[PDB]
Design an enzyme around this catalytic site. Sequence first.
Site, PDB file in Angstrom:
ATOM      1  N   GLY A   1      32.222 -12.498 157.274  1.00 34.66           N
ATOM      2  CA  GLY A   1      31.094 -13.023 156.532  1.00 34.66           C
ATOM      3  C   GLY A   1      30.812 -14.485 156.820  1.00 34.66           C
ATOM      4  NE  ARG A   2      33.628 -16.803 152.505  1.00 34.09           N
ATOM      5  CZ  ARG A   2      34.734 -16.997 151.795  1.00 34.09           C
ATOM      6  NH1 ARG A   2      34.895 -18.116 151.100  1.00 34.09           N
ATOM      7  NH2 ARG A   2      35.672 -16.061 151.763  1.00 34.09           N
TER       8      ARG A   2
ATOM      9  N   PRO B   1      41.034 -12.528 163.958  1.00 34.19           N
ATOM     10  CG  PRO B   1      38.921 -13.303 164.556  1.00 34.19           C
ATOM     11  CD  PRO B   1      40.317 -13.789 164.222  1.00 34.19           C
TER      12      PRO B   1
ATOM     13  CB  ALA C   1      35.977  -0.246 139.943  1.00 33.69           C
ATOM     14  CG  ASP C   2      31.938   2.640 135.373  1.00 34.16           C
ATOM     15  OD1 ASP C   2      32.358   3.284 134.389  1.00 34.16           O
ATOM     16  OD2 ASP C   2      31.175   1.657 135.270  1.00 34.16           O
TER      17      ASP C   2
ATOM     18  CE  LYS D   1      35.602  -5.406 147.171  1.00 39.35           C
ATOM     19  NZ  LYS D   1      34.492  -5.797 148.082  1.00 39.35           N
TER      20      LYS D   1
ATOM     21  CD  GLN E   1      38.825 -13.417 151.985  1.00 36.27           C
ATOM     22  OE1 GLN E   1      39.702 -13.043 151.203  1.00 36.27           O
ATOM     23  NE2 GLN E   1      37.779 -12.664 152.305  1.00 36.27           N
ATOM     24  N   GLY E   2      41.405 -16.756 156.273  1.00 34.86           N
ATOM     25  CA  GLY E   2      42.601 -16.944 157.078  1.00 34.86           C
ATOM     26  C   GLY E   2      43.015 -15.862 158.057  1.00 34.86           C
TER      27      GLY E   2
ATOM     28  N   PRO F   1      34.358   8.569 136.361  1.00 34.11           N
ATOM     29  CG  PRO F   1      35.865  10.314 136.705  1.00 34.11           C
ATOM     30  CD  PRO F   1      35.593   9.135 135.786  1.00 34.11           C
TER      31      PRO F   1
HETATM   32  O1  LIG Z   1      39.732  -7.130 149.972  1.00 30.12           O
HETATM   33  C1  LIG Z   1      38.577  -7.416 150.156  1.00 30.12           C
HETATM   34  C2  LIG Z   1      37.459  -6.531 149.963  1.00 30.12           C
HETATM   35  N1  LIG Z   1      36.220  -6.968 150.201  1.00 30.12           N
HETATM   36  N2  LIG Z   1      35.980  -8.271 150.667  1.00 30.12           N
HETATM   37  C3  LIG Z   1      34.596  -8.619 150.934  1.00 30.12           C
HETATM   38  O2  LIG Z   1      34.432  -8.808 152.342  1.00 30.12           O
HETATM   39  C4  LIG Z   1      33.621  -9.960 152.596  1.00 30.12           C
HETATM   40  C5  LIG Z   1      34.492 -11.018 153.254  1.00 30.12           C
HETATM   41  O3  LIG Z   1      33.610 -12.073 153.613  1.00 30.12           O
HETATM   42  P1  LIG Z   1      34.159 -13.479 154.198  1.00 30.12           P
HETATM   43  O4  LIG Z   1      34.363 -13.273 155.749  1.00 30.12           O
HETATM   44  O5  LIG Z   1      32.994 -14.392 153.956  1.00 30.12           O
HETATM   45  O6  LIG Z   1      35.426 -13.884 153.494  1.00 30.12           O
HETATM   46  C6  LIG Z   1      32.980 -10.318 151.256  1.00 30.12           C
HETATM   47  O7  LIG Z   1      31.757  -9.616 151.133  1.00 30.12           O
HETATM   48  C7  LIG Z   1      33.983  -9.834 150.234  1.00 30.12           C
HETATM   49  O8  LIG Z   1      33.346  -9.451 149.008  1.00 30.12           O
HETATM   50  C8  LIG Z   1      37.017  -9.194 150.887  1.00 30.12           C
HETATM   51  O9  LIG Z   1      36.829 -10.293 151.292  1.00 30.12           O
HETATM   52  N3  LIG Z   1      38.283  -8.708 150.597  1.00 30.12           N
HETATM   53  O1  LIG Z   2      36.799   2.359 130.366  1.00 29.06           O
HETATM   54  C1  LIG Z   2      35.598   2.413 130.408  1.00 29.06           C
HETATM   55  C2  LIG Z   2      34.733   1.325 130.764  1.00 29.06           C
HETATM   56  N1  LIG Z   2      33.420   1.529 130.849  1.00 29.06           N
HETATM   57  N2  LIG Z   2      32.848   2.753 130.450  1.00 29.06           N
HETATM   58  C3  LIG Z   2      31.405   2.815 130.449  1.00 29.06           C
HETATM   59  O2  LIG Z   2      30.953   2.961 129.101  1.00 29.06           O
HETATM   60  C4  LIG Z   2      29.872   3.912 129.042  1.00 29.06           C
HETATM   61  C5  LIG Z   2      30.369   5.132 128.275  1.00 29.06           C
HETATM   62  O3  LIG Z   2      29.239   5.978 128.103  1.00 29.06           O
HETATM   63  P1  LIG Z   2      29.362   7.454 127.443  1.00 29.06           P
HETATM   64  O4  LIG Z   2      29.265   7.257 125.875  1.00 29.06           O
HETATM   65  O5  LIG Z   2      28.115   8.120 127.942  1.00 29.06           O
HETATM   66  O6  LIG Z   2      30.646   8.125 127.867  1.00 29.06           O
HETATM   67  C6  LIG Z   2      29.431   4.127 130.494  1.00 29.06           C
HETATM   68  O7  LIG Z   2      28.441   3.163 130.836  1.00 29.06           O
HETATM   69  C7  LIG Z   2      30.706   3.894 131.278  1.00 29.06           C
HETATM   70  O8  LIG Z   2      30.445   3.435 132.613  1.00 29.06           O
HETATM   71  C8  LIG Z   2      33.622   3.854 130.057  1.00 29.06           C
HETATM   72  O9  LIG Z   2      33.151   4.893 129.717  1.00 29.06           O
HETATM   73  N3  LIG Z   2      34.984   3.626 130.085  1.00 29.06           N
END
Ligand SMILES: O=c1cnn([C@@H]2O[C@H](COP(=O)(O)O)[C@@H](O)[C@H]2O)c(=O)[nH]1
Ligand SMILES: O=c1cnn([C@@H]2O[C@H](COP(=O)(O)O)[C@@H](O)[C@H]2O)c(=O)[nH]1
Lengths: 217, 218
Positions: A194-195, A181, A66-67, A64, A177-178, A69
């Site tokens: 998964g589960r 398949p 989500a940081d 996932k 989660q419901g 670039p």
């Molecule tokens: O929208 C999303 C994105 N990722 N997962 C991931 O997919 C797997 C789903 O597993 P499950 O069959 O045990 O619910 C888990 O690893 C979970 O983090 C979700 O369930 N939903």
């Molecule tokens: O909105 C956010 C949240 N997290 N970080 C994190 O904070 C640190 C910023 O480091 P920098 O001083 O080297 O830019 C990095 O670990 C980065 O993933 C951001 O920069 N912005």
Amino acid sequence: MDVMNRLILAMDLMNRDDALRVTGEVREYIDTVKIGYPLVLSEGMDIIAEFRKRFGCRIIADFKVADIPETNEKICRATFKAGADAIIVHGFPGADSVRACLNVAEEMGREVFLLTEMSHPGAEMFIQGAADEIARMGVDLGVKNYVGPSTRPERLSRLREIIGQDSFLISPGVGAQGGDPGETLRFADAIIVGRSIYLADNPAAAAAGIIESIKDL
Amino acid sequence: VMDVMNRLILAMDLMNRDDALRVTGEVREYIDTVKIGYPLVLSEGMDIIAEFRKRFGCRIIADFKVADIPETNEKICRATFKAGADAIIVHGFPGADSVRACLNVAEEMGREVFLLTEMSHPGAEMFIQGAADEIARMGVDLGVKNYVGPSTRPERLSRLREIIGQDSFLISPGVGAQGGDPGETLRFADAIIVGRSIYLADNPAAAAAGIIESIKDL
Ligand SMILES: O=c1cnn([C@@H]2O[C@H](COP(=O)(O)O)[C@@H](O)[C@H]2O)c(=O)[nH]1
Ligand SMILES: O=c1cnn([C@@H]2O[C@H](COP(=O)(O)O)[C@@H](O)[C@H]2O)c(=O)[nH]1
């Protein structure tokens, strides 16, 4: 990606022994395993190589991402260094963060999977309203692999419409989660489970059962 | 709230154990709070948290931007706190249930959750910014006491501080490399997060000391 039986195992057990034992018990049914932070943070990134050594399966790192670039680039590099074939990245943080991941994937010969809408209830609060736009962003960026919710077939169908038949789509939320398949496979190329499998009394029978229900697909 | 020395948190994103340890050790006298993220953890293992605790007298904030479903979020938090992290950073965009899952584990395990509202990078303007105020309000409604906001957008950081109130704890990244100013960021944030400006400097200690000198009156 050619996923055996259109079934991807979400191996979220947090014990190396159990994870390996269960995966081995269902190995004849799959060739693609999704490994996430539950297992990686509990046993270390070396678990990825262990899976490839024991099963030869492809590995999708569901991190996932989500940081920003700069950090996304480092995360992808460390992940691919560990042997992951692909990585799942959130689209909510914007185009630049996704591009950072695409760059590293291209450089190391891997794939990026863009997560557009999540399967849990909370996804309706902020993610759902931005999902279609996130998908269009993926298209503009040249993304070819996507992740959409099994729990909302109408939303999954919309995602398929946006990305086209050529793009690859995998979908979690099946079973526990419901999600169904067969219904999910009307739109997704492969289902993530998964589960329903790893928590079942007999994982092998569980996997076999799911496959039986989608035999015509 | 945690007492962050010099209101400065080191973002240790070097990916080499030897370098990460050397640099952190060199700025040890200026910082008692270190933010460890996935760049280092995925490169050296969760035991790196244990090693930092043993080598330095520093609190550890795991910047894992937790952003999964509730069930998975719980597992991530459990593993992270088990490793010795004092707190964990969680994304709010995935919704209330996903945040609540983290709060529940933190409560049962005696640790803290930091809720990331808006991010500091350009891409944050596409989807995150528009949901930020609501994510912050959601955090307040859920009882969240610790937050993360962008130093790169003073106007946005100021609004976040208003929403969460003066009693909440707020830390802010984007200082230095991304353009944020230390002093101005501290007008709203309790502490600033600094990574590259310190760990990529020829003399990390001097870089940290320099930043601290620029905010001495604060
Ligand atoms: O929208 C999303 C994105 N990722 N997962 C991931 O997919 C797997 C789903 O597993 P499950 O069959 O045990 O619910 C888990 O690893 C979970 O983090 C979700 O369930 N939903
Ligand atoms: O909105 C956010 C949240 N997290 N970080 C994190 O904070 C640190 C910023 O480091 P920098 O001083 O080297 O830019 C990095 O670990 C980065 O993933 C951001 O920069 N912005």
